[PDB]
Amino acid sequence: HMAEAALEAVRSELREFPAAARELCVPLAVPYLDKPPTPLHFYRDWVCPNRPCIIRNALQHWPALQKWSLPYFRATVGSTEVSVAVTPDGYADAVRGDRFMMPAERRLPLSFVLDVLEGRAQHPGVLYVQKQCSNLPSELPQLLPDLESHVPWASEALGKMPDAVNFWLGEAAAVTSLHKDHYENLYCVVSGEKHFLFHPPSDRPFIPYELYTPATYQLTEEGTFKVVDEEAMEKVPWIPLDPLAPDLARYPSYSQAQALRCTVRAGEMLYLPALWFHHVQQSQGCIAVNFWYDMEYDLKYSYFQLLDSLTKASGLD
């Protein structure tokens, strides 16, 4: 009886938190820094308040920035075998139909990827060097001397070294579905550009989540794609909504969230804070590197956990 009234009160506060939080803590545009910050300034101004920014002139020390290019990769590591994600439509690790679709895993010489990117050669579907798991040192070690194993002022600020360094090189059709990571992320564009769409963690009440049975694409011999359910896998929660084409009929509440878009260009470094929902688009053959630092699990993390569970518990998700 009366409990229903208490439930709507709780729901109203959860619905009001995302607006309150952004007016106080979320920028109106992802800000630019004229130069790398000091470790103290970085932690106080961006890391602790959990706020994104793009740092200019932070890679001028990197040999890679003057050297890296599709022709340079061909000459330098063309024969190196790399892991390449293949999908029919360019959405790896994304909800397609009623399944969480995982990429097809293929080993291919880098040279081939470069030909496909340049339109020199074809392949069914969409290619993306996107292995992660610190794929830069793991698969293209010969490129390590062309960059720093870490961002010194950022590593000093956080008091720890990165847990992984990943290399990203994909087709323009290769889109990363909206998701969040429990890492502090420094995303460095060496060539081309990346188009980032953001939601802050405090938008959680309006970001829909559902459980999907996991599946993987299997690439046939006939040049088509099959779906192989991962029968021996626990189910995985994921965000079904496309921020670029949101289904406001199924999840009207996403309109009450507010996305923050931005583009990061070659030579620029983006600080993407921990737990921020992000969706990523790239230019054809974009070359990028990102540094992952495990986040600190403190009051901000415990608070988000409460927000995430209460979003579900209150029936907003």
Ligand X SMILES: O=C(O)CCC(=O)C(=O)O
Contacts 24+ apart (CB under 8 A), 5-13: 7/314, 7/315, 10/310, 10/314, 11/314, 11/315, 11/316
C-alpha distances in Å from residue 248, one per residue of 128, 179, 197, 252, 255:
30, 19, 18, 4, 7
Q: How far apart are CA 8 and CA 16, in angstroms?
A: 12
Structure-block tokens of residue 239: 């965000």
Q: Would you count residue 207 as binding a second copy (CB under 8 A)?
A: no
Per-residue binding string, ligand X, 165-194, x by CB under 6 A, is ---x-------x----x---x-x-------
Per-residue binding string, Mn ion, 166-185, x by CB under 5 A, is ---------------x----
Q: Which is nearer to ligand X, 176 or 202 (CB)?
A: 176
Token pair 């600080």 is found at 271
179 annotated ligand-binding residue: yes
| Residue of 27, 31, 39, 78 interacting with a second copy (CB under 8 A) | 39
Assess contact for 132 and 83: CB atoms under 8 A. no
Give, as ranges, the residues between 11 and 40 that touch Mn ion (CB under 5 A).
none
Q: Would you count residue 298 as binding a second copy (CB under 8 A)?
A: yes
Q: How far apart are CA 35 and CA 32, in angstroms?
A: 9
Q: How far apart are CA 283 and CA 277, in angstroms?
A: 21
Q: Would you count residue 299 as binding a second copy (CB under 8 A)?
A: yes
How near is the Cβ of 295 to ligand X at its closest, in Å?
A: 12
For the annotated binding site, the residues are 179, 181, 278
Which chain residues interact with a second copy by CB under 8 A? 3-4, 6-7, 9-10, 12-14, 17, 20-21, 24-25, 39-40, 43-44, 47-50, 156-159, 201-202, 296-303, 305-307, 309-310, 313-315
